[PDB]
Amino acid sequence: SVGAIVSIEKAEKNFVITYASGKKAQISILNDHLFRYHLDPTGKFEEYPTPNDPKHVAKITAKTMADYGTQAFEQTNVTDSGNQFILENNGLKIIFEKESALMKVLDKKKNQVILEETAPLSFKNDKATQTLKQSSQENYFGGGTQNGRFTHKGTAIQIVNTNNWVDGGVASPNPFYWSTAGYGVVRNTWKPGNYDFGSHDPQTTTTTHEGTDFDAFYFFNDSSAGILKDYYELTGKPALMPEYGFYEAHLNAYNRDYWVKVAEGTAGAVKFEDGNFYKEYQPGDLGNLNGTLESLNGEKENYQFSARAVIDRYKKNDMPLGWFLPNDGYGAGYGQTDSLDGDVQNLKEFTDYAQANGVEVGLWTQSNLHPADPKNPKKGERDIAKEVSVAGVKALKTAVAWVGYGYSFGLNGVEDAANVFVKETDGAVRPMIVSLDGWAGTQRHAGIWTGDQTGGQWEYIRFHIPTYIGTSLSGQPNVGSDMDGIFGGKNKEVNIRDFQWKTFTPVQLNMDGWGSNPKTPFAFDQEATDLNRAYLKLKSMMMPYNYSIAKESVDGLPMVRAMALEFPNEGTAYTKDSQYQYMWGPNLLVAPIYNGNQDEAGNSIRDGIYLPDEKQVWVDLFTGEKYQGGRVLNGVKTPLWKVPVFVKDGSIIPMTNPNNNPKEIQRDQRSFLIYPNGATSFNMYEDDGISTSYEAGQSATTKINSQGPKSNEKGDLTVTIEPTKGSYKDFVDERSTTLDLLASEAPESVTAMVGGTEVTLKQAANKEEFLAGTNLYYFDKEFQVNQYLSEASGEKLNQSALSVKLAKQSVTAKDVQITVKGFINKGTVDGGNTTVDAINEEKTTPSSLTLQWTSYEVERDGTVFGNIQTNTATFDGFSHTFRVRAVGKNGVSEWSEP
Numbered sequence: 001s002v003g004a005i006v007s008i009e010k011a012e013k014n015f016v017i018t019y020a021s022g023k024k025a026q027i028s029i030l031n032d033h034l035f036r037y038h039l040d041p042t043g044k045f046e047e048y049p050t051p052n053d054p055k056h057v058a059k060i061t062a063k064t065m066a067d068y069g070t071q072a073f074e075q076t077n078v079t080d081s082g083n084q085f086i087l088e089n090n091g092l093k094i095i096f097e098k099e100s101a102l103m104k105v106l107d108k109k110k111n112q113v114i115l116e117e118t119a120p121l122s123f124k125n126d127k128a129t130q131t132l133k134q135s136s137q138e139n140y141f142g143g144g145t146q147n148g149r150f151t152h153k154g155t156a157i158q159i160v161n162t163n164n165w166v167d168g169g170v171a172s173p174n175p176f177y178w179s180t181a182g183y184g185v186v187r188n189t190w191k192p193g194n195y196d197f198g199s200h201d202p203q204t205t206t207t208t209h210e211g212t213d214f215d216a217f218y219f220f221n222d223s224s225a226g227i228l229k230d231y232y233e234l235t236g237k238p239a240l241m242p243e244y245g246f247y248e249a250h251l252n253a254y255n256r257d258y259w260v261k262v263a264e265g266t267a268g269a270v271k272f273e274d275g276n277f278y279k280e281y282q283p284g285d286l287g288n289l290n291g292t293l294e295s296l297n298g299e300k301e302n303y304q305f306s307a308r309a310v311i312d313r314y315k316k317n318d319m320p321l322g323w324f325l326p327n328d329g330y331g332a333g334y335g336q337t338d339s340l341d342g343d344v345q346n347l348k349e350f351t352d353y354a355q356a357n358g359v360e361v362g363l364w365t366q367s368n369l370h371p372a373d374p375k376n377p378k379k380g381e382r383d384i385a386k387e388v389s390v391a392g393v394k395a396l397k398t399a400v401a402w403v404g405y406g407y408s409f410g411l412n413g414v415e416d417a418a419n420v421f422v423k424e425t426d427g428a429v430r431p432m433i434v435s436l437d438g439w440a441g442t443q444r445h446a447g448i449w450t451g452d453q454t455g456g457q458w459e460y461i462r463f464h465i466p467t468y469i470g471t472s473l474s475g476q477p478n479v480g481s482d483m484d485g486i487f488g489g490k491n492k493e494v495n496i497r498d499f500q501w502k503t504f505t506p507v508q509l510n511m512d513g514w515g516s517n518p519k520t521p522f523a524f525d526q527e528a529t530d531l532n533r534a535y536l537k538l539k540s541m542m543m544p545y546n547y548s549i550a551k552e553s554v555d556g557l558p559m560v561r562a563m564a565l566e567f568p569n570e571g572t573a574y575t576k577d578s579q580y581q582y583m584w585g586p587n588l589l590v591a592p593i594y595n596g597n598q599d600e601a602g603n604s605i606r607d608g609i610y611l612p613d614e615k616q617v618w619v620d621l622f623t624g625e626k627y628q629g630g631r632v633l634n635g636v637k638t639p640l641w642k643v644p645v646f647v648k649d650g651s652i653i654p655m656t657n658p659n660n661n662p663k664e665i666q667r668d669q670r671s672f673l674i675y676p677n678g679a680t681s682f683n684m685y686e687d688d689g690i691s692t693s694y695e696a697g698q699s700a701t702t703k704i705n706s707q708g709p710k711s712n713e714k715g716d717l718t719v720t721i722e723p724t725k726g727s728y729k730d731f732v733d734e735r736s737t738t739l740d741l742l743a744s745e746a747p748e749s750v751t752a753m754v755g756g757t758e759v760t761l762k763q764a765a766n767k768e769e770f771l772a773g774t775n776l777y778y779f780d781k782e783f784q785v786n787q788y789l790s791e792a793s794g795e796k797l798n799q800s801a802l803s804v805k806l807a808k809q810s811v812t813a814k815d816v817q818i819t820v821k822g823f824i825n826k827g828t829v830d831g832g833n834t835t836v837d838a839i840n841e842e843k844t845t846p847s848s849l850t851l852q853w854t855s856y857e858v859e860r861d862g863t864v865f866g867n868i869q870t871n872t873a874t875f876d877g878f879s880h881t882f883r884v885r886a887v888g889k890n891g892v893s894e895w896s897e898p
């Protein structure tokens with residue numbers, strides 16, 4: 001312990017705290033809610049922590065202390081207030097008890113103590129530990145990719161480069177956590193740590209990092225978006241993926257292995273287009289067998305075994321494919337020549353072919369990306385500069401084999417790679433890097449994938465959902481994983497369920513070559529293939545929405561959102577009651593199927609669907625079925641074709657034509673799927689999709705406003721598309737406009753103003769007239785959000801919509817105002833009417849209680865459960881008070897005895 005504080009002095013650039021031990025700390029005030037506290041036993045007070053190697057020059061911070069300016073520091077006063085020293089600016093009171101040295105921070109806007117040390121910093125055992133008060137309602141997020149976990153109260157998390165990709169490991173640590181009390185802390189260290197959020201003593205949180213230094217950035221903010229924006233201003237805004245990065249990729253090696261003709265039914269046999277069965281061999285496993293060597297371009301009497309042939313199969317199977325890594329395999333390489341330049345020419349010809357097919361090429365790496373002598377490369381070296389400038393590579397994946405050391409290593413590597421992409425293309429290619437073993441800052445260059453796990457089993461989904469959520473809460477919105485795992489497979493239902501929910505996630509990797517079957521969306525039967533295509537096409541149609549929430553995640557909430565981000569006033573949104581669902585942007589609640597529980601009809605039984613907000617209607621995206629929030633639904637029947645996705649009524653979802661890659665998007669069209677519910681709004685972002693020019697303001701935004709009746713009510717609806725602001729290379733100014741307004745009745749009238757001039761709309765007599773014509777509207781009871789899913793599910797999945805089409809117009813010069821009179825979107829709402837119209841001892845397990853007494857509701861520890869279809873209900877996931885009420889046609893009853 002450094003002892004009592006004897007003095008706090010305002011120096012030229014920071015406040016100097018002198019402890020009775022003679023140890024000093026510097027407080028740097030960066031803005032009115034962010035400060036750095038640096039207790040440096042060495043007295044050097046260097047701006048940056050020591051990395052694990054001096055060549056690791058990429059910094060945690062993206063903004064220097066000097067870049068924040070001196071204003072907040074100038075406007076912070078130190079006062080000697082008897083038993084305390086106080087630092088005070090417009091934002092914070094930082095209060096230090098003189099005798100104990102304990103720091104506490106009053107947020108002056110809240111007039112509440114947000115952070116309070118309860119024991120002094122401890123430097124024992126070559127670690128630096130802070131001990132904080134933990135309050136009963138205080139929750140904690142962050143830590144990076146905390147495999148299986150997102151909400152950390154009552155647990156400890158390891159801030160360690162664990163190189164463990166399965167539940168309970170850490171695929172990508174981050175020394176960043178935040179408290180729902182309204183603070184975030186970045187430990188300014190490259191050293192591993194352990195954050196114990198009151199795992200045995202619930203009133204104490206301890207944060208420990210190895211080392212002899214205590215250096216931390218403390219930021220105070222009253223919103224989760226503000227905490228993340230603080231983290232991003234400090235450590236770097238997330239990179240915005242190029243549009244193609246949101247599309248599934250195919251990853252494997254096509255330069256190294258051999259295919260041997262085998263019998264059908266041979267272990268590992270794969271059928272090819274010649275109608276024969278082949279089994280894949282590494283060259284060293286061939287033994288006396290003879291096979292056909294793979295190549296990227298299939299130029300060697302081997303076309304069906306080539307990387308080109310895989311592009312052709314995704315095309316033949318009409319599957320989206322954004323990008324392709326053809327060298328993803330240990331020692332695989334990307335050419336078979338005697339030179340790097342010969343291999344780069346082979347890869348360039350692959351990239352020409354991939355690009356002719358609308359697919360970008362990335363490379364995997366297990367190594368440094370530069371030759372020992374770039375002017376004289378050796379065969380088998382890497383030269384990301386030539387790979388980029390000569391071969392046209394646009395993306396990079398960093399194997400643990402490269403970045404496995406962790407901490408400063410990965411950040412240095414991905415920073416250097418990002419700079420090469422940009423420099424070699426003069427900014428024509430923005431970075432597209434997928435990494436792991438990250439740290440604070442990684443997000444500004446790279447997204448993460450979660451590493452190697454076994455698919456073909458429900459645990460593959462179950463642990464991934466919270467993993468994504470917690471990754472995103474850690475300031476990494478660009479998260480992905482392998483589609484149905486790198487290992488295993490042979491479980492059709494898991495495969496379909498994985499493609500389903502990852503539609504509503506950023507990055508999808510078909511990590512092929514290691515599994516129980518090929519890793520593609522067409523590896524299973526036609527039922528699975530058509531479902532996977534349907535969900536992949538839905539993602540392609542959602543690209544304007546997805547790109548818009550991606551833009552938001554550059555300086556705001558991430559794309560995968562913990563329930564608490566969108567519903568901060570509900571306790572359920574913070575706990576493991578929210579571990580298996582999330583908001584995909586603001587507008588979609590995704591509650592993936594994550595276990596094999598079923599009925600005899602093969603329907604999955606989904607428990608614990610938490611629908612927030614007693615005042616909010618949630619709309620099944622596929623069927624239009626409506627559900628009242630403020631409840632957790634158990635026993636929800638979910639057919640194989642379906643993933644539980646609910647639209648937040650009010651949602652504007654920008655859409656586009658189904659497409660297999662960004663070059664197939666019609667840039668001369670725009671389309672909005674709207675669920676009007678009072679006054680809502682959406683900001684649609686666009687840019688050139690590929691370059692760094694967005695960072696220099698080459699982008700455009702379009703504000704869409706929907707102003708109509710509340711859910712299920714009738715009224716006037718005004719949809720206003722404000723003029724598009726901004727421009728960029730190959731910006732298309734002249735676009736047609738579609739609105740698909742979910743509606744339950746034909747309107748009284750639909751009128752259209754374009755830049756203040758009326759456009760006469762005709763009522764289409766039928767769908768074919770509507771589809772053929774422009775300046776029309778059409779009330780359609782056969783509206784399909786996803787025709788591929790309708791066809792794949794064997795369900796029509798018809799919904800009712802009022803669709804409106806306007807002719808091409810200048811989107812910059814002229815707005816759109818559509819007025820619908822007699823607008824209504826009414827359906828029956830499950831739990832819509834909350835109007836007031838024993839413990840079964842023999843069934844008590846260790847962790848499940850069964851209560852007995854058109855449906856019922858039960859309150860479990862202050863959380864309301866619904867969809868209880870019979871005369872009993874069991875509650876589990878226990879290591880409790882039960883009230884029950886009846887549900888009928890005309891409302892409910894009041895709470896029975898606790």
Ligand SMILES: CC(=O)N[C@H]1[C@@H](Oc2ccc([N+](=O)[O-])cc2)O[C@H](CO)[C@H](O)[C@@H]1O
Pocket residue numbers: 165328329330364398399400401451452486511513514
């Ligand atoms: C975490 C990581 O880098 N994963 C890579 C890596 O994966 C494996 C997979 C299996 C083993 N093993 O059986 O011991 C080791 C490493 O390299 C793969 C190369 O194809 C993939 O890139 C995978 O994502």
